[PDB]
Every structure is written in structure tokens, then in C-alpha cells.
Amino acid sequence: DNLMERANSMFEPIPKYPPVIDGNELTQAKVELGKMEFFEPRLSSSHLISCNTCHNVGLGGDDELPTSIGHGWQKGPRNSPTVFNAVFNAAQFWDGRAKGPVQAGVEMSSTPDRVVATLKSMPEYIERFEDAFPGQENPVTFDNMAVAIEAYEATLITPEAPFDKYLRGDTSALNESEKEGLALFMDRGCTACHSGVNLGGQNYYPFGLVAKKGRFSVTETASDEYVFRASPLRNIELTAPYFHSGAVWSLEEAVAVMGTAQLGTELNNDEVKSIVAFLKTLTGNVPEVTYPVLPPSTANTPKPVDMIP
Template sequence: LALACAGLCTAMPARATDAPDATALRETANTLFGAIPHSVDEVRGQEITAAQVELGKSLWFEPRLSRSHVLSCNSCHNIATGGADNVPTSIGHGWQKGPRNSPTVLNAVLNVAQFWDGRAADLKEQAKGPVQASVEMNNTPGRVEATLRSMPAYVEAFARAFPGEDQPVSFENMARALEAFETTLVTPDSRFDRFLAGKGSLDATELRGLSLFIDKGCVACHSGPNFGGQAYYPFGVVERPGADVLPSGDKGRFAVTQTASDEYVFRAAPLRNVALTAPYFHSGQVWDLGQAVAIMGSAQLGHELDATEVQSITRFLQTLTGRQPQVANPVLPPSTSTTPRPE
């Protein structure tokens, strides 16, 4: 575990009374983090087309991707509420409670892999999961294809999005279109991004919070433009949190790799827009951002942050809220006589 911060940690003073030098801090922050891009134009080297994004937007809000015709992607990743559902663990098919908190989809395209345990390589692979998961949308690829093929407007939209293919309406292309839409869910121009670009300032408390975030070592795991989402670490490197926050039944990445050292290992959560996405952690058991920060201090760094430090870091994290995507509600095609009925 590389918990040192490449020699940069020592560059900034960390005492609460110090007023950090904004210019030096900006320079350091630019090397450690970086701005959220205004747009993402390709995935896996393939260009994303407007027709794919348009189709993906319809599918994102499409409740008929679920067996019940009740749940859409947006049910659990509401774009109006930070791309998450703001409940401890998601409610899916038949009011079943899932095992984990819903992570935000905002800026998810920037993560190295998807899910708390990184078990899906990218957004395309990820999108096939919830549609089939029995506690989420509880559907099957065949039933989804039958549903989409029953509506002429979808058949045309898939043909426009995936021209030249023999059978454009497929489960695979549903996933590709959803991924294309999700690449548009980036949130640039946060106050922090404006600070990085030299176009805006942070107040003294926020600067202190940024300085502490770097000096105390948070940055060792939460770095890059998305402030995390790039690598995996034990939750409880130094001190394992209580079973309320870290339930013993969810061993995280161990389920993916079957390697003993991956027990209770999770992807370092990306912290962009974190002020909008309570409750926190994969268990969704912590409602207060300050409390989540304090838990990170003791669990990951073996350091009891004092109240002022927690407050400064929390104030800083609030500057990571970016411009939220403006998405016009799509009008979805009506069901036809051949559309599978809700179950």
C-alpha cells in the first residue's frame, strides 16, 4: 500500500491556524487531481454518436427495461439528486432491499472499473448487470429484446444508433447506448475546478481543507480528476470500522478475485459531488459527510481528525459539486399489443 503522497505531502503546512498559500496549493492540486472534462467523446477508442446518446437517454428513463415496468436506471441513479437514490441500500424489484448503496453515475465514466468492488470493466459491461439482477430490475436479455422490438420507434432508434448491423436491437446494443448516454453525465465547473483553472477562489477554510486532504494522506487513495475510483484498498487499513458501517457479510473485492488479501477491499470511492450523495459507504449507513470524513481518518489513516479538521475537509469536499447535467425528460414510445406485460 503506497500511503505516501509522492513527496508532495510535505509541501503544504497542515496546522489549522495556517492560512495556506493559494497559489502553491493550486499548483500542487493540479498535479494531484485535475479538472473534470467538459465532455467525453469516445469509449474504448470508439466514437460516441449523437444517435447513441439520444437512444441511451430514452433507455435510461425506460421502466420497461424492468420486469415490473416500474424501475428505470433513473430510479436508483436519479439525475435530479446527484445520480444516486439517497437511501442506505437500493430498493429493487418487488420492494426488495439490495445489499449495497447506489453509487452516483455522475462522472462514472472516469472510474477505472464499475461497482464498489470493480467487478465490471466498463459502463457497457456494467449496464447488463442491473437489468438482470433479481433484486434490481429482474429481467432477462430475451425479454428486454422482445420489449424493445415490439415498439417501432425503438427499432428505428436502434437502427440509427447502430447503422449497418443485421440486428441492431440487441441486449448488447442496449448496453452500448446506455454507456453512450452515461458518458454525457460529467459535472465540470465545480468551484474546485474553477480554482484549479485560476478562475475562482476557495475561502480560507476550504483551502485548509484541501491542504489537510493532501497532507493527512487522503490523496493517497482519492486522487485524479474523480478524487478516487482508480484503485482498491481495504476498508479499515488501520482500524476496521464497526459492523454497522462494514457489515461482515460483504467481503468486497474478495468475491471478484477469490484472493484472501482482497477481503473487505473496495474501490476508493470517487468524491466528486459527494455532498449530494448521502448516505455514505457501500453500506450506506453514514448520513453525515463529516462523520464519513472522521471514519476515513481513523479507519484508513489511523488518525483521529479533530473537529476543526473534519469541518475544513468537509467544507472542501463541498466544493467538488459540479455543474449538474441538464437532461430533458424523453418521451418514450407507447407499448404495443406485442410488448411483454409487466410481471
């Protein structure tokens, strides 16, 4: 199969087991702590927002809103991307600009000092930090908190999508209609920006969605100065709405506004549908999640702050 070897030169399948990213070892104590952290709403000053609020594991790893809640409980500027397979993305933000997603996420509703004070006020967290970061005198630090969360994110991968079975050899994993969408995807230029393990998530490009249904289009930015990350398309079927602003709900419309003659990627209606069929084959196994049990607050725990004072 030439189609198959072509696909294997452009893409890679999601690893079957959680990866060690940047030397972040997956010990049980660290992954368990990270899981607690991920669902811990007390990392926010209101005690109501956790990573799971915006990267909902039951909703595709994101929040299914055009844009996430920003300051107060007002509309934020960006669509929250899925946390599923995110550890494989070299480009982590929508806009080309040194904080990482974890830090940016927490700071959206709180401060490092307050987060640390919160975690040290609960005996169980101190014990877990001590067990997850053995031999450190002050294990509960904002950096270690991030390392633990990151270790947990490494387990939030979605292996075994039909397409990955195909890449691994099962010529039958994709049907006729899906092989066309795949051929189109590799023939009409999509792979110039959306390739690798997540079919995207690696580079910024000078193209963004703008108001032009057919109310939007992706157009080159002035002088190519501002750039947007070409989104990782893996699990795209489950991460609507689309684009940096979440302005497009239809996956079909999303593919349409990216496949124009004026991009070097022209697609007619049927060709759009074929790509959509191929994109659906990118949905992998949602990782199983056992809800953690968080420890109760103590007298030293900073009190919740009202969102709307």
C-alpha cells in the same frame, strides 16, 4: 501557488464536454436512444424500474437510500453510487470480485432476451437502433443497448465545480477555509486512495466500514483479502448516505470515520470541518435533462410481471 500545482499533480478537472470513452462516439442518434433507455422502465420485468429509479438525475444521480431495492422490493446489499462522472471510474463496483454496471443494472430485474424482445416490439426503438448503429442487420441487441446507454452516461458529467475552476487557474475559486481542507486532504493521506479526475473511483483497498453518532468505523479487512473501492468523492455533498452500505448520513461523520491515527490519516474536529468545506467545493453543474418520450407498447410487447406475484 504551490497548493495549486500540488492539486494539479494529484487531481484533474472534469472535462468541459462529454468524452469519447472506449471509442464510444457521441452521435445524436445514439445519445438520444441512450437517454430513452436510461428512463425506460420497461427494461425491468415489472415495467416500473429504470436506471433513473436508482440513479435519479434529480437527486444527485443516485437514489438517496442506504441501499437500493434488490430482488422483489426488498433491501439490496449496496448503496447505489452516482452515475454522474461514472464513465471516468476504472473501478466500477463497491466490492473487488465480468459484467459492467449497465448489464448488472438491467439483469437486476430482467433478462437479456426479454429486454431485446421488449425493444423489438416497438417500431420506434427499431428505427432508433437502426439510426444509432448504421449498417448492421440486427442492430437491436443487448450489447448495442448498453453502448447507447453508455453514450448517454458520457453526457452525464458535472463540469465547472469551484474546485475545477481552481485547478484550471482561478486561485480565488476556493476560500481560505476550503484551501485548508484541501491542504489537509493532501497532507493527511486521503490522496493515497482518493485522487485523479474523481478523487477516487480508480482502486480497491482492504478497508471497509463496519459497525464499531459514532457507531461505525472504517477498518482494515482480515489479511487484506476483501477490498472496497475507494469512492469517487466528486459531488459527495449530493450523494448521501455514505459508504458501501449507506449507513452514514452525515458527511461530517463520514470524513471523521476515515481520518484516524489508526489509518495514517489523523484529524481533529476542526480539521474534519475543513475537509468537509473542501469536499463541498467538488459539486459541479448538474447536467440539464429533458425527459424523453417513450413509445407505447404494442401487442408483441412482453406484459408486465407483478413484483409481488
